[PDB]
Every structure is written in C-alpha cells, then in structure tokens.
Design a protein around this ligand. Structure first.
Ligand SMILES: *[C@H](C)[C@H]1/C(=C/c2[nH]c(/C=C3N=C(/C=C4\NC(=O)C(CC)=C4C)C(C)=C\3CCC(=O)O)c(CCC(=O)O)c2C)NC(=O)[C@@H]1C
Ligand SMILES: *[C@H](C)[C@H]1/C(=C/c2[nH]c(/C=C3N=C(/C=C4\NC(=O)C(CC)=C4C)C(C)=C\3CCC(=O)O)c(CCC(=O)O)c2C)NC(=O)[C@@H]1C
Ligand SMILES: *[C@H](C)[C@H]1/C(=C/c2[nH]c(/C=C3N=C(/C=C4\NC(=O)C(CC)=C4C)C(C)=C\3CCC(=O)O)c(CCC(=O)O)c2C)NC(=O)[C@@H]1C
Ligand SMILES: *[C@H](C)[C@H]1/C(=C/c2[nH]c(/C=C3N=C(/C=C4\NC(=O)C(CC)=C4C)C(C)=C\3CCC(=O)O)c(CCC(=O)O)c2C)NC(=O)[C@@H]1C
Ligand SMILES: *[C@H](C)[C@H]1/C(=C/c2[nH]c(/C=C3N=C(/C=C4\NC(=O)C(CC)=C4C)C(C)=C\3CCC(=O)O)c(CCC(=O)O)c2C)NC(=O)[C@@H]1C
Ligand SMILES: *[C@H](C)[C@H]1/C(=C/c2[nH]c(/C=C3N=C(/C=C4\NC(=O)C(CC)=C4C)C(C)=C\3CCC(=O)O)c(CCC(=O)O)c2C)NC(=O)[C@@H]1C
Ligand SMILES: *[C@H](C)[C@H]1/C(=C/c2[nH]c(/C=C3N=C(/C=C4\NC(=O)C(CC)=C4C)C(C)=C\3CCC(=O)O)c(CCC(=O)O)c2C)NC(=O)[C@@H]1C
Ligand SMILES: *[C@H](C)[C@H]1/C(=C/c2[nH]c(/C=C3N=C(/C=C4\NC(=O)C(CC)=C4C)C(C)=C\3CCC(=O)O)c(CCC(=O)O)c2C)NC(=O)[C@@H]1C
Ligand SMILES: *[C@H](C)[C@H]1/C(=C/c2[nH]c(/C=C3N=C(/C=C4\NC(=O)C(CC)=C4C)C(C)=C\3CCC(=O)O)c(CCC(=O)O)c2C)NC(=O)[C@@H]1C
Lengths: 160, 161, 190, 66, 160, 160, 161, 161, 160, 161
C-alpha cells in the first residue's frame, strides 16, 4: 500500500521519512475507512457486475464466443467469466491499498505471456474490464466511482 | 413467467424442433408430480398465517432485531418484515405449482439484494427466516411434497445470499 | 456562450399537448386523443395502437361520452394487456415506477410513495393500485377528468426532475413481455 | 359489476384556471360501484354538489353476481 | 400453459390460488398424458399433413400459385409450405400446453402486420390452416380430433 | 361459478372463449352430477355436523364459552352455532358452483370488519370451520371429502 | 353477471334455505344441456366472421342504409355497424353458455335504445340484422343447439325493440 | 428541436448580433433547397410501406434473423422490427424537411443503443436496414433530393453504431 | 420557425406531414426572400427606430422617466432603450423564421416574472413596442409593413 | 424532515432510553430560541420579494449572466433563476424555524449539484446569490435572529459548493 511506497523511496535515498511524506501517510490512513466502504459496495455487487459485463463483452465481440474463438463452449465461457471475476477482486484490493501495486503483482505482470499461450485475445479482455468499469460506476456514487475508475483504467492500460 | 411445460416448449422452439419422445418424457414426469403439488399448495394457503408465525418465532422474534436499535424494531418495521415473509411464501407456492424457479427470479429475486442493502435490512437474518419457513412448511405438506417445496425455498435463499 | 436550447430546452415544452375529448368533436379529432391515451399508458411510441391492444367497448363508451377520460384510463390499467406487458414481467418496486410514469407522467417522488403502492400490490390487485393512482390527488390536480395524461417533468419535489428525465427519456422498456421463443445471441449479421 | 351513473357540478374555489374546465365542472359519468364511494367523497371535499346518482347496472339487494 | 395462466391471475389479485383454479390444474395434469399422445400423432404425420393441406389450398386458391400471386415459383411455394409447417408445430405446442398462449405469442401477435409487409393474403393462410385441420382430424380419433380442432380453430380465428 | 369466471376473463380480453377455457367448462359439467351428490350428503348431515363441530370448538377453545368470552351464554352460543350453520350452507353452494366466488361474496368480504365490531375472535371462527371440515370429511367418501376439503380450506384461509 | 347455477343459488340465499332436491333438479337440467352448449359456442366462434357477413348481406348491405344519406353510409359508420353486430354475436354466445339472459341486460341491453335514438341509428333495421344472424347461426349450430341459441337472439331483439 | 433557420438565429442570438448578410446567405441557401425537400418528403410518405418492404427484403428477411433462434423470429418480433424501421423513416423525413439533424438526436438517437443492448437486438443488422432504406429512398426521391436524404440516414446509422 | 411547428404537430399525431402542411412549407420558402429583405431594412434602421420609439414612449408615459419611475436616470433610461433594442432584434428573427416561436422562447416566456422582479410596468413596455411598430411601419412598404405588424402585434399581445 | 425536538427524541428512541434531564436541557435551549425564530420568519415572509430583488441586484443582474450568451440571458432563464432564489429563501426560513439543517439536505441539497451540472447553471454564481440573500436577510431580521438565519444560508452554500 501507499505507505510501502513512501518507505521504499526513503530507503533508496537512505534517509528517514520526510515530513511531507509522513503527512501523505497520515492523509491515506484517514482516507482508508472511506476506501473500505467503496470496496465493500463493489464486493456486494460483484456477481451482478461480472454477469452484466460478460454479456456486454459477448455482444461487443461475437467472435470470442464462436467455434473458432477461445471463449466458445460452456467450460471456456465459465473460465472467461472467472477471469473477469479475478480482475474485479484485484480492483477491490487496489482500492483498499490505495495503490495499483497489489493489483499489478497478481494480474498485470506476465499477463501478455499467459494470454498468448492461452491464445485469448488481449484486446477483448481489456473490453471486458472496461465493461465491468461501466457497470461498477453506475452502482457507485460519483466521487466513489472516480476513485474506482482510476484502478479500472490502470487495468485497461496494462492490458494494452 | 414460465412453467415446466412452457420451458420444454421454449427450448424446442429455439431449436425449431418438433416435440420428441425425450421431451415428452420430461412433460410426463411433470404431470405425475402435478397432483401432489396441488395438494401441497392448498395446505400452505390454509396454514400460511401460522407458518409465518412459527418461522418468526424460530428466528426473528425474541432477538436483537426486535429489540430497540434492531432492524425489525418499531411496529412499522415489524409489519414490513412479516409482509416480506408472506411474499416469499406466496411466490414459493406459485413456483411449486409451476415446477419452475423462473417466477422467483422475475418477481422476487430481481433487485432484492440491492434494495435490502440500501435499506440496511440484514440479508442473513432474512435467509434464516426463509429457511425456518421451509422447515415448518415441510412438516405440513408431508415428505413427498416437502422435497419439491424445499428446492424453491432454497432457490430464494441462494438468490438473496 | 449558452444557447436557448441549453437547460430544460425548447423541445420538452411544445411536445406536450393537453387533450380534451369533446362530445361534438369530429371522429378524427376524437381518435387522435384516444390514440394518445394508449400512447402514454401502454407506451406505444409508434403512437398508433395495434388493433389487439385497443379496447373497443371502452372506446365506444368514450366516444358516446358515457365515460370520462379518467375512467377510460382506469379501464386500461384494469385490462389484461397492461397486466401482461407491465406487471407480470417486472419486479414489485419497478412495477410501481412504471405505474407513475404511465399514470402521472413522473418518476416516483419518494421511497415512501413506492412503499405504499408496493403494499397495495402485495395485499390487493394490480387493479387496486391502478385505481389508487387515478384516485390520488396529484392526478386529479394535473389532469382532473378531461385531460389525457402527459409526460410532465415536475421539479417541485427535489430530484424528481432528474428522475423524471431518466424515466421518460432513457429507460425505454428493456424486457420482452412474452417469455416464449427466447432470442439466441448470435446470428447478429445478415 | 354494479355501475353508477352520476351527474355532479364542481367549482374551482382555490385557483383561477385559464384552460377550459367546463368538462371538469359538469361531468355526467359512469362509475364502478367500488370507485363511487371514493369519487363521491372527492366531489364533496372539492365542495362540488352531486346533482343526481343512479345505479346504471346491477340489481339492488342482490347477494351474488354483485 | 394452463398453469401459467392461473398463476398470473392469482399474482395480479395478490392471492393464493383459488380452489376452483386448483381444480382446473388437477384436471389438466390428468388430461396431459392423453394430450401428449395427440401431439405425438400429429408430429409423426406432420410431413404428410403439410403436403396434403398445401395441395388442397392450391386447388382452393389457384391465384396464390400464379405469376401474380405471392406463392408462385419454387422458392415462394417452399416458403408457403414452411409457414404451414410452422403453424402445425405451434398447434402441437398448444395441445401439450393446454392453452393457446404458447401459440399466440409465437404466431398470432403482429401476424397481420408481418403478412401485410410480405403482401401474402391473410385469408389464404387461414384456408391453409383449415386444410391442415381436416387432414389432422382424419388421422386423429374423434375425441382426440375435437381437442385438436379447438387449437386449429383458434388459429383460423386469429388470422382473420 | 366456473362458467361465470371464464366468461368474465373472456369479456375483459374482449375475445371469444379460448379452447382451454372451453375444456375446463366441459370438465366442470361432467363433474357437476357428482358434485350435486356431495352437496346433498352434507345438507342431510348438516344439523349433526354443526352440533359436533360446535362441541369440538368449545373443547378446543374453553375461553370463547366463558364469562369473558363472546360465545358465553345461551343466546350467544346459539348465534355462534348459527354462524357455523351459515358457513356450511355457503360451502354447499360452493361445491355445486365449482368455484368459491358464491361463497366469497356472501361470507368472506368484510368478514374481518364484521367480526371485529362484534369482537368475536377470528381464529376461533376458523377453528370451528376446521372442526366442521373434519366431521364432514368422515361422512363423505375419500374422493368426495377431498373436493369438499378444498372449499373448507378456502374458508379457513379467508378468515385467518 | 349471473349464470343459471348462480341464479338458483341466489334465489335460495335470499330465502336462506339450504339447497333442496327441486333446486338440485334445475341444476341437473342445466348440466345435461351444458355439453351441447359448449359445442355450439365453438361452432359460432369459428364461423363468427362469416355469420356477420351473411347476415349483413341479407339485411344491411345493398340497401338505402349503405347508400349516401343512409345511417351506414361512409366507411366509419359501416365499420361501426359491423362492430355492433359482432358484439351482439359474442354476447349471445356468452349468454348461451351461461344459460342466463342477465349478461345481455347488464352489458348490451342497458341504455342501448337511448344511445341509438340519440345517434339516429334505426332500431328496426338493427333488430332485422340480429334476426338474420340468428337464422345463420341456427344452421351452423344444428337443431338442438339452435333452440337454445334462438332464445338469446330473441331476447336481444325484444330489448332493442 | 432545431431547424436550419432557427440554428442560424440561435448562433446570432448568443452573439447578440443582428442578422447580417452572411447569415442571410445561409438562410437563402436553405430556402432554395426547401422546394426540393418538400417534393422528396411527399414521395417518401406515399411509398413508405414499400420502402420498408424493399429494405427488409434486401437485408432483414431470408436470413438467420428470421429463422428460429434469430432476433426477428416470431411474428411479434418481426412486427417490432418493421415498426422500428418505420420510425427511422418518418424521423429522417422530418429531419430532411427541417434541414437539421437535431431532431434525430432528441427523439430517435437518445438511449436507443442502450435499449437495443439490453434487448439483444443486433445493432449492425439495424444499421444495415437503415442503409438499405437509404438506397431505396434515393431511387424514389431522385438525385438532387437523394444527397440531402442520404445525410440524415447516415446520421442515424452513425448514432446507432 | 414554420418548419419546426409543422414537424412538431406531425410528431404529436405520429404521422408523416400532411399535404396541407407540406403546402404551407412551400408557401413559406417562396415568401422567405421577401421576408429577408424586410428584416434587412429594419436592421439598418434599427438605431433610429429605437431612438424614435423611446422618445414617443417617454412622451406617452412621463411617469416612467420621473424620479419615482423605473426608467428615470441615465443608467435606467439606457437599460429601457436596450430592452427596446432586444425586442426589435427578436422581431427581425421572427420575420425570417415566419413564426413567433424564436421570439417567444427568448422574450415572451417568464417576461411577466422578470419585469415584476424589476418592478418595470408591463403596459409601458407594451407601449414602447407599439411605438417601435409605428416607426418601423413608416420605413417599410405597406405590404412589408403588414407582415412586420403581425410580429409586432404578437409582442404587444404577449406582454400586456 | 427532522426538527431539533424530534432529533433529540429520535436519538433517545434508538437507545430506547426514556427522556432524561440532559436531553431536556437541549429541548429547553431550543424553546428559548423559538420565540426569536418565529419573529424572524414573519419578517422574512413579508419582505421575501424585496430580499430576492436586492440580492439579484447585488450579484446577478447588470452582469455577464444577464448579457447575451450568459446563463441568465432570455426571460425564461431569468425567471428560472429568481424562482430558484425564492426556493432557497423559503427552505432556509423553514430550517430556521425547525432549528435543524436536515430539511435542507432532504429537499434542497439532494441532487441539486447534479441537476445544475446537467443544466450548465454556474454553481459559484448561485452560491454568490445565496450569500447576498443572507446579507439582506441579516439586516431585516436584526442581530440576534441574524446569527441563527446565517447558519442555514451558509449550510445551503456549502452544500452547493
Ligand atoms: C400486553 C398489554 C399484551 C400482550 C403482549 C405481548 N407482546 C408480545 C410480543 C411482542 N410485542 C412486541 C411489541 C412491540 N415492539 C415494538 O417495537 C413496539 C412499539 C415500541 C411494540 C409495542 C414485539 C416486537 C414482540 C415480539 C417479541 C420481542 O420482544 O421480540 C407477546 C408475546 C407473543 C408470543 O406468543 O410470542 C405478548 C404476550 N399480549 C396480551 O395478550 C396482552 C393484552
Ligand atoms: C423480514 C424477514 C426481514 C425484513 C424485511 C423488511 N423489508 C423491508 C422493506 C422492503 N422489502 C422489500 C421486499 C419486497 N417487496 C416486494 O414487493 C417483494 C416481492 C414481492 C419483496 C421481496 C421491499 C421492496 C421493501 C421496500 C418497500 C416496502 O417496505 O414495501 C423493511 C423495511 C425497512 C425500512 O427501513 O424501510 C423490512 C424491515 N427486515 C428484517 O429485519 C427481517 C430480517
Ligand atoms: C439563479 C441564482 C442561478 C440560476 C438558476 C437556474 N436554474 C435553472 C433551472 C433549474 N433549476 C433547478 C433547481 C431546482 N429544482 C429543485 O427542485 C430545487 C430545490 C428546491 C432547485 C433549486 C431545476 C430542477 C431546474 C430545471 C427545471 C425548471 O426550470 O423548471 C435555470 C434555467 C434553465 C432552463 O433552461 O430553464 C437557471 C437559470 N442560473 C443562473 O444564471 C443563476 C446563477
Ligand atoms: C348495425 C347493425 C347498425 C348500426 C350501428 C352503429 N352503431 C354506431 C355507434 C354506436 N353504437 C354503439 C353501441 C354499442 N357500444 C357498446 O359498447 C355496445 C355494447 C357492447 C354497443 C352495442 C355506441 C355506443 C355507439 C356510439 C359511439 C361509437 O361510435 O362507438 C354507429 C355509428 C354512428 C356514428 O356516426 O357515430 C352505427 C352505424 N347502424 C346501422 O346502420 C345498422 C342498422
Ligand atoms: C362575467 C361576465 C360574469 C361571471 C363569471 C363567472 N364565472 C365563474 C365561474 C365559472 N365560469 C365558467 C365558465 C366557463 N368555463 C369554460 O371553460 C367556458 C367555455 C370556454 C366558460 C364560459 C366555469 C366553468 C366556471 C367554474 C370554475 C371556473 O373558475 O372556471 C365565476 C365564479 C363563480 C364562483 O362562485 O366560483 C364567475 C363570477 N359572473 C358574473 O358576475 C358576471 C356576470
Ligand atoms: C402459405 C400458406 C402462404 C404464403 C406464405 C409465404 N410466406 C413468405 C415469407 C415469410 N413468411 C414468414 C413467416 C413467419 N416467420 C415467423 O417467425 C412465423 C411464425 C413462427 C411466420 C409465420 C416469414 C418470416 C417470411 C419472410 C422470409 C423469411 O422467412 O425470412 C412468403 C414469401 C414472400 C416474400 O416475398 O418474402 C410466402 C409466399 N403466401 C401465400 O400466398 C400463401 C397463402
Ligand atoms: C373496386 C375498386 C373493388 C371492388 C368493389 C366492390 N365494392 C363492394 C361493396 C361495397 N363497397 C362499399 C364501400 C363504401 N361505402 C361507403 O360509404 C364508402 C365511402 C364513401 C365506400 C368506399 C360498401 C358499403 C359496399 C357494400 C355493398 C354496398 O355498397 O351497399 C363490392 C360488393 C361486395 C361483395 O363482396 O359482394 C365490390 C365488388 N371489388 C374489387 O375486387 C375491386 C378491387
Ligand atoms: C429491425 C430493423 C431490428 C429490430 C427491432 C426490434 N425492436 C424491438 C424492441 C424495441 N425496440 C425499441 C425501440 C425504441 N423505443 C423507443 O422509445 C425508441 C426511440 C424513441 C425506439 C427506436 C424498444 C424500446 C423496444 C422494446 C419494446 C417495444 O418493442 O415497444 C424488437 C423486439 C424485442 C423484444 O423482445 O420485444 C425488435 C425485433 N431488431 C432486429 O433484430 C432488427 C435488426
Ligand atoms: C423600457 C421600455 C422599460 C424599462 C426597461 C428596463 N429594463 C431594466 C432591466 C432589465 N431589462 C432586462 C430585460 C431583458 N433581458 C432579456 O433577456 C430580454 C429579452 C431578450 C429582456 C427584454 C433585464 C434582464 C434587466 C435586468 C438588468 C440587466 O440587464 O442586467 C431596467 C432597469 C432595472 C432596474 O431598475 O432594476 C429598466 C428601466 N423600464 C421601464 O420602466 C420602461 C417602460
């Protein structure tokens, strides 16, 4: 989380934490409670978000759920939805952490390589995440949505 | 809504297939179960008030919920909770006759979780109440009917949770 | 800088036409009103009812002047077709929302309003809730008997303007009334 | 179902209205029996006077078919 | 179906199923096995019913299969027969359901509008259905035929 | 009656009677003769059914026939028995009609309000009806009893 | 509305009498007639369009009415007249199933004379059309059914006149 | 909504400027085009049913959509699709007379994409149908009118997609 | 504009434009060139029309430009003249549009409320518009004046 | 809505506690302030039209907003803005009598920001107008009343911004 980031910068400089850096940590700990609520909201709506996003994705990309496509078949379609669920879980983790680092380690490093072996199209995966963002935004209040959006956007950027 | 008979028909219609023996067998299965279901439904309707009372006694009342600061505190909230209980019972009875869970999805299940979360109604307690109703219903309907009745109650519970 | 069509805009006003049936009115005048009743209540935005939707007996009474427009509107909510297309598919809370849009032209003002109507639906018929809305004071004030309902985006209750825009402008019905013959997702292209 | 034919006159005491209100003011109408009670009350609350009430359809003092 | 209709009426009234309504359900479940057999019979004879009815229709209405007429030409004649087949399938669905509702949603709502765009004459379509009824009646036993007749009559009534 | 109910639904839809609706009418007319006998049986045994049910009710609820209770005293006890008799007459009417509508108009609408003014307990009245059902069931044959039970159950449901 | 079964019940209810054998006999009479009536109703529904066509041909069309200055002149009026004809047919069918004339009084007959007089619709011509429909219906239904069908048609005719 | 004349006026009003020759020239341009537009509109109205028929034949029918499991399968769905086609045609005609695309945005375009996505109506096929209507319309209206007509059809297509 | 009005009526009726409506559009497009010239004339003479009308108004109503009156003082008198200028601009817009709608949205809806807050007398404003009409009429040719008069009259009618 | 008296009651009700002296003291505090508030409210109601006029003069009018291309340009927009000003005044008066800010949140404040953003109404200018009204109101009500009045005006301003 954020605090880890601050510590790491200090260690590189080989110095004790700067007052300004300390202040940012203080702000973060205050913000955390609000962040937890935002995460809680998405967790409760998780099942519906995934379902809605999946449908949107399949409409946007008929090919993925076609005999040629990776997603085609019940087993495969389930796996595609499971992947969407995974990314949502990662996003929630990110919001509470206040940083993308938790998200990044689990989901964004080696993602290209993994999907290329699977042969899943990366752009379609990105569209799914975008779709999830739109659903999530609607349920969230505007300010909460903006916070959540940043994490969603990062994912989309990473898988691109 | 849809019923078991219509569900079979709809599956065939999307295929464009005429009804076949395998399909007919599913329909035949439903027809045998039908008579039992009708008897169960009549039992539930007659004992509905008591079923709700017993279930509330088992889970809802004599609890923190009814005590001040609890969700079911105040007459208005208490009345709302028992109204919801009645809804679940009526719809489950409808589903049992139909032989299909779809009606529950279309009317009861859709948007309920979100409504409850905004209201601050506790889902787990509600689920507990549904399970309690199931147990009471099981007794009255008798064993053959109980199995059929249970699945719809469980469906409601799973949806809410 | 801002333009005339910026806030509320010009369009919403001037797309509302009060309609009053007059006994001596010529048929074509009368029908246009009748068509609009169907249009708002049953959400037939083509704006001409299909023959099967239409209620003849009620129309004949209305043309005769035996029944008021308010009464004709009550009959439409009483009718099966309404129950078929609106009550049956939707959930109890949604059904209320539709009711207020179909009758009263606005989005539900408050959660309390929603609760009262839900209670009616649960304890008494769809008809009873339809009766209540037509019976309700607000309906009487805005349309009385003679006026055919219209979209009216109110604004005096707080937030209703936003809600009313949402319900009238965006939420075009998104569910099939009929369960039968569900559409397969593919075959997109021709 | 029993039906009521009602003639009533209603005055607009609270507010002056530009649009023609003649249809609202004098309205001979057919009312479902169930609705009439509430309707009668509404006319009374307005201060309108109900000139005539008749039962258009149904039989008075019928136990069933009502 | 019978059951769907009963449930829907109850839900509108917001009441449990009436005894009378329950009785009708009981009657229907008893009837169902007989109904299944009636439907099965028509399905087996489907190909011949359509063929015989088509011939009768074309004799009754020379015009439809004439250069002016809609049915004229191989492609068009096939489509006309396909339509007859569709209606037969709907009738079988109706018999098992015990109600016209399944038939009605798929075939009778908007039928006028569809055929008017196509320019197909509605009365000729009705005659074809009547023709199919006569063929179907012959194969069915008398009591079975009466049951089947009701559904056939409804279709003819609807397309008028 | 069954017939009235069917006609009313048709008139609302502004359509001729559906085949399914017609079938239910056919079933009802066949059932009617059996129904008439069931009703006749209960009418003959009416006096005893009421008497036996009354005794059971008073044993079930000592309070009602107690100085505090509404039923207490000869006049009051007679009225309670008269009420039971009324409900039995209604049930017989229902069986012949094949529908609860006749029962419903005379007995079940405004019943709560009437009894609340009287201060009679509604649950006790329901128990009396249940008691009458048990007596009636014994005199009836099993299949006959089931038919009668439905009407009895409706009454109990209506007042609850 | 009322039906034969309910009519018997209603008469007994005002007396307060339990159902008696004499009453039962009337009910039994109805039950025997019932099967015939159901068959007749199905016939009428299927041939309704034709029945109206034939009756109109017999009385309404090729007449002064259809000619300019006649009550059925203009498409709107023509359509209205055939709509009214359909009403009469549908209600008569309902009455025949019911076995009671009351529905005709409650829906069709009440206020029709007055409406027609204000409109200037000719009552005698309308009655003529009803009688024509009766004759056509009689043929299709067959003799046993025809007697039952005829009384309701005659009832409508008498009411209008 | 807005029209070309009002659009010019509105631009001037926000500036607060009185109408000037340059503005007048734009208005004059519209006035010359006007006569052509009126003729085109009358052509479209008369041939509307046929235009829809031809366009459907070109794209919608004889396709998977019409075949079972397709969006336009069943009479109800078929009727809905042709109703939508009519809407697009009527509004395009309105836009052509107006000389402004705004009405399309205010009535047709707003919320349609979202509605269609929930319904599962295929947007690309709908767009195809609109393009087909354009081609048919182009023929009937004639070349000068066709260019004007085409822009509004294209606007609808772009909005949906 | 004429066209907007026609479209709106058609949309309410849910019909394509009527022949009569189309004819009115045709007439309007022919009239437009004449209308443009009328508007141009008034624009050129705008400054003098306003000045002359102001003087006439002040003669007609001494009170408005009096210590009590709203118009009194240089700042206030300028504002009164600015208002007259605004209305003239609106009238020109109206003539080109061929309808009062453009005028109506900018100037006539809420006018009463605005002036009541300002405390400006509405009748005096109307007199000013009447005055402007007379000046404008003199510069215009007779037929041109009649066309212009209608728009001027509407304004006077709207605000009185 | 809620008022000070009810707010105390509600806090006690959730605790389930009977009213206590500490609670009574808060209620007593309100009762003393009450008389002043009533006088202030009457003053505001009588001078409401003028208050709005003065505030508009101070901020809204003689500005770019009123000039063409400004939000309050055109009669319709001008009238809307003064209507909004009246709303704020009326609700603030209600809040002052109540002694609670909640009503402002429930009616005025909820959804206003979003409405304004869609409309393109400028929030800062609106806030300016509210502050201007406060200043005018302060004068009329007098000092003791002004302090109470000011907090509600400030609450509205903070909500909007
Ligand atoms: C005493 C005058 C009568 C009586 C009382 C009685 N009550 C219960 C059970 C409950 N009573 C309440 C009532 C309230 N909850 C609220 O929030 C309010 C308003 C502030 C009220 C009045 C509730 C919630 C219950 C449920 C139990 C609980 O505490 O959670 C009983 C028990 C009934 C049973 O069988 O369970 C009784 C006996 N009964 C009488 O006969 C007296 C006339
Ligand atoms: C009782 C077991 C629990 C409980 C119930 C409770 N519900 C509400 C409010 C609502 N509940 C619903 C649910 C439905 N309404 C329907 O029509 C249907 C389908 C037929 C359902 C399932 C809805 C929509 C509402 C809101 C409007 C209304 O009240 O009708 C409350 C009130 C909460 C409040 O603060 O308003 C309560 C108490 N809550 C419990 O404590 C139990 C666990
Ligand atoms: C005046 C200080 C400023 C201003 C205001 C302004 N508002 C509108 C339009 C609307 N304002 C509202 C606001 C409310 N509705 C409510 O229910 C409440 C709470 C009680 C408020 C405050 C709404 C909903 C509308 C739109 C609906 C309607 O107008 O009836 C406008 C004009 C927009 C238009 O196009 O008409 C204006 C000008 N704008 C300014 O310039 C001032 C700074
Ligand atoms: C046809 C046999 C004859 C005929 C009929 C005719 N009727 C009208 C107009 C009306 N007729 C009715 C009747 C009914 N409305 C109902 O609801 C019922 C009961 C279900 C009936 C029988 C009514 C109310 C009207 C007036 C309003 C309306 O048009 O709906 C006309 C048209 C008169 C006109 O100009 O409006 C006609 C022609 N007249 C003939 O020529 C035949 C002898
Ligand atoms: C003025 C010369 C005389 C006068 C008028 C007066 N009228 C009313 C009340 C009503 N007047 C009407 C009339 C109409 N409404 C319409 O729609 C039409 C046709 C377009 C007319 C002519 C109506 C319906 C009413 C009732 C409700 C309403 O306000 O419209 C009153 C008030 C009566 C009361 O006590 O409320 C008055 C005073 N009265 C005179 O003294 C003049 C000779
Ligand atoms: C035969 C009795 C008559 C006839 C038939 C005919 N039909 C078409 C074309 C179509 N018919 C349909 C019908 C349906 N689609 C459905 O979903 C249903 C209900 C399940 C029906 C009844 C459709 C969709 C088409 C269009 C083609 C397609 O399937 O995509 C034609 C061809 C006309 C043309 O030009 O397309 C014909 C001839 N016409 C007659 O003359 C006979 C009396
Ligand atoms: C000729 C293009 C088509 C054709 C003609 C045809 N018409 C009839 C019968 C009638 N026509 C009317 C129509 C009207 N009555 C009106 O008042 C108006 C409006 C002014 C119209 C258009 C009527 C009322 C009739 C019925 C008989 C009568 O006129 O009294 C027939 C005879 C009907 C029959 O089937 O016997 C015919 C043949 N037929 C075609 O095929 C041509 C395309
Ligand atoms: C035809 C080219 C394509 C097609 C059409 C189609 N649409 C529906 C259903 C709806 N379409 C709409 C559209 C609108 N409603 C509006 O208010 C507006 C703008 C103001 C539009 C354009 C809506 C809301 C519906 C739903 C309810 C209704 O139909 O009234 C269907 C049927 C879907 C269903 O399940 O009912 C169809 C077939 N679909 C295609 O596949 C064609 C490419
Ligand atoms: C002159 C005939 C009369 C007169 C004019 C007058 N006006 C004001 C102030 C304003 N006038 C307007 C008017 C408009 N705004 C618009 O958008 C339009 C339509 C395009 C009009 C007509 C406005 C908004 C104001 C407010 C100030 C501003 O522009 O910022 C005044 C002074 C206001 C005052 O004293 O408070 C005057 C004098 N008054 C008369 O008595 C003349 C008869």
């Amino acid at each position: 989380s954020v605090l880890t980031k601050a510590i790491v910068n200090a260690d590189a400089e080989a110095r004790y934490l700067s007052p300004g850096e300390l202040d940012r940590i203080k702000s973060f700990v205050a913000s955390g409670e609000r962040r937890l609520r935002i995460a809680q909201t998405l967790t409760e709506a998780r099942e519906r978000i995934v379902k809605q996003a999946g449908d949107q994705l399949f409409q946007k990309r008929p090919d993925v759920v076609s005999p040629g496509g990776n997603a085609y078949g019940e087993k495969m379609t389930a796996l595609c939805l499971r992947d969407l669920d995974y990314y949502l879980r990662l996003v929630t983790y990110g919001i509470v952490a206040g940083d993308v680092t938790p998200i990044e380690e689990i989901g964004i490093i080696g993602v290209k390589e993994m999907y290329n072996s699977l042969q899943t199209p990366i752009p379609a995966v990105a569209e799914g995440v975008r779709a999830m963002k739109n659903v999530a935004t609607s349920l969230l209040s505007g300010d909460d949505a903006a916070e959540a959006g940043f994490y969603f956007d990062y994912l989309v950027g990473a898988m691109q | 809504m849809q019923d078991a008979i219509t569900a079979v028909i709809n599956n065939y219609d999307v295929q464009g297939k005429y009804l076949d023996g395998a399909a007919l067998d599913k329909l035949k299965a439903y027809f045998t179960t039908g008579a039992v279901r009708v008897r169960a439904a009549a039992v539930i309707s007659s004992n509905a008030t008591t079923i709700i009372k017993e279930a509330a006694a088992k889970a809802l009342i004599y609890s923190d919920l009814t005590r001040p600061g609890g969700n079911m505190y105040t007459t208005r909230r208490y009345a709302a909770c028992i109204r919801d209980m009645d809804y679940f019972l009526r719809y489950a009875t409808y589903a049992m006759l139909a032989g299909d869970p779809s009606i529950l999805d279309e009317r009861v299940l859709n948007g309920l979780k979100e409504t409850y979360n905004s209201l601050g109604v506790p889902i787990a307690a509600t689920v507990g109440g549904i399970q309690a109703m199931k147990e009471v219903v099981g007794g009255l309907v008798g064993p053959d009917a109980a199995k059929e009745a249970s699945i719809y109650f469980d469906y409601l519970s799973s949806g809410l949770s | 800088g801002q333009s005339v069509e910026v806030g509320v805009g010009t369009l919403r006003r001037q797309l509302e036409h009060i309609y009053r049936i007059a006994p001596d009115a010529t048929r074509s005048e009368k029908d246009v009103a009748i068509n609009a009743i169907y249009r708002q209540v049953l959400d037939v935005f083509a704006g001409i009812p299909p023959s099967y939707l239409r209620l003849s007996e009620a129309e004949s009474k209305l043309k005769n002047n035996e029944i008021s427009v308010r009464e004709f509107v009550r009959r439409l909510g009483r009718s099966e077709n309404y129950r078929k297309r609106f009550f049956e598919p939707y959930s109890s809370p949604k059904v209320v929302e539709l009711l207020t849009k179909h009758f009263l032209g606005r989005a539900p003002i408050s959660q309390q309003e929603i609760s009262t109507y839900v209670q009616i639906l649960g304890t008494k018929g769809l008809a009873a809730a339809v009766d209540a809305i037509v019976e309700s004071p607000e309906y009487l004030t805005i349309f009385n008997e003679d006026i055919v309902p219209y979209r009216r985006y109110p604004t005096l209750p707080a937030g209703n303007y936003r809600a009313s825009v949402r319900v009238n402008d965006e939420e075009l019905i998104s569910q099939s009334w009929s369960s039968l013959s569900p559409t397969y997702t593919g075959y997109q292209y021709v | 179902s029993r039906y009521f034919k009602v003639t009533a006159c209603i005055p607009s005491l609270k507010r002056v209205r530009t649009g023609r209100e003649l249809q609202n003011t004098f309205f001979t109408k057919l009312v479902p029996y169930e609705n009439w009670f509430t309707e009668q009350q509404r006319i009374q609350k307005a201060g309108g006077k109900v000139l005539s009430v008749k039962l258009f359809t149904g039989v008075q003092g019928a136990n069933t078919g009502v």
